């Protein structure tokens, strides 16, 4: 192994699924969220992009995906008994969907 980071790998990676929360791991940086297609273009030196300190864009197979936080990862239980409880998702906005 003359170099670290040349990365011979079986089975070339494929386009990810846009619209489901999944914990990715892209170029030594693991993160969790959903992806969507964007018309945002950034510098070819970089695949990851940071706005401040949060990951905002990834670039996979030449396609730029804007990273969003998945809002349904956490909930409270308004617990009364075994057959009656309520659920509250404190960080999800259910105005539309």
């Amino acid at each position: 192994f003359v170099s670290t980071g040349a990365f011979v790998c079986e089975s070339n990676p494929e386009a990810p699924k846009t619209g489901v929360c999944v914990t990715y791991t892209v170029e030594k940086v693991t993160f969790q969220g959903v992806l969507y297609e964007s018309n945002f273009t950034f510098a070819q030196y970089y695949n990851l992009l940071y706005v401040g300190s949060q990951l905002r864009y990834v670039r996979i197979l030449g396609k730029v995906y804007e990273v969003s936080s998945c809002f349904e990862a956490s909930y409270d239980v308004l617990y009364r008994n075994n057959q009656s409880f309520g659920l509250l998702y404190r960080s999800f906005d259910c105005n539309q969907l």
């Binding site: 003359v2 170099s3 670290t4 980071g5 040349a6 945002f40 273009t41 950034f42 510098a43 070819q44 030196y45 970089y46 695949n47 990851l48 992009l49 940071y50 706005v51 905002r56 864009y57």
Partner: protein, 214 residues
């Protein structure tokens, strides 16, 4: 030299991440802003020269109004005490004026000068580049981290041991123009500011004055 474009230095700087709208401090082997380090105007036939540095940066002057006369910049970076199992680099270009350059970091068996083919070659590709208003590139071996910077892209390989010092660069002398070369000796520290998408558009080297260090 005399006509070194210092506004082309923006195209070669990179931060370690992709950062948006951000002022950052980067360090490494970056080209000298002193005009007394750009070997540019040699008419003696020794435009070849050599260097004992840690990288080299090349800047083609301008291509807007010779024509077909472009740079050649044959670069043969040497692992100063050469054996059979060491690594050399040989970046080559002809007059063009079309795109095709070549890199070919291979493992050769002699020192005198780039045959048809060699054994055990790590990178071997064309990677074509188009001429711009003015173009600037450079390759870097600082603690054996090879960085071939052809803007916009980049190529990085951390090899375990090279000990590259000798450069043996060479351009076609007495050409239509004179491409300028910069052999870097020590690492610097630069204050850069990136734009919307992550591209550097302002720089200041930290050791070029009193205010620059503040």
């Amino acid at each position: 030299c005399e006509s070194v474009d210092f506004n082309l230095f923006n195209t070669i700087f990179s931060t370690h991440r992709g950062l948006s709208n951000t002022t950052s401090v980067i360090t490494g082997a970056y080209p000298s802003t002193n005009k007394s380090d750009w070997s540019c105007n040699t008419r003696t036939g020794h435009l070849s020269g050599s260097g004992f540095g840690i990288g080299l940066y090349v800047q083609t002057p301008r291509e807007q109004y010779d024509g077909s006369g472009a740079g050649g910049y044959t670069i043969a970076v040497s692992p100063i005490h050469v054996t059979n199992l060491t690594w050399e680099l040989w970046i080559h270009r002809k007059w063009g004026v079309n795109s095709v350059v070549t890199v070919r970091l291979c493992r050769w068996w002699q020192f005198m000068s780039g045959p048809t083919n060699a054994f055990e070659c790590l990178i071997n590709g064309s990677y074509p580049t188009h001429r711009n208003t003015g173009y600037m590139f450079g390759v870097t071996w600082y603690n054996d981290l090879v960085r071939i910077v052809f803007p916009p892209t980049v190529l990085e390989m951390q090899l375990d041991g090279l000990q590259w010092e000798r450069v043996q660069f060479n351009s076609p002398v007495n050409a239509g123009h004179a491409t300028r070369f910069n052999v870097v000796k020590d690492i610097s520290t630069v204050l850069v500011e990136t734009n919307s998408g992550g591209s550097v558009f302002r720089y200041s080297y930290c050791a070029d004055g009193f205010v620059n260090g503040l």
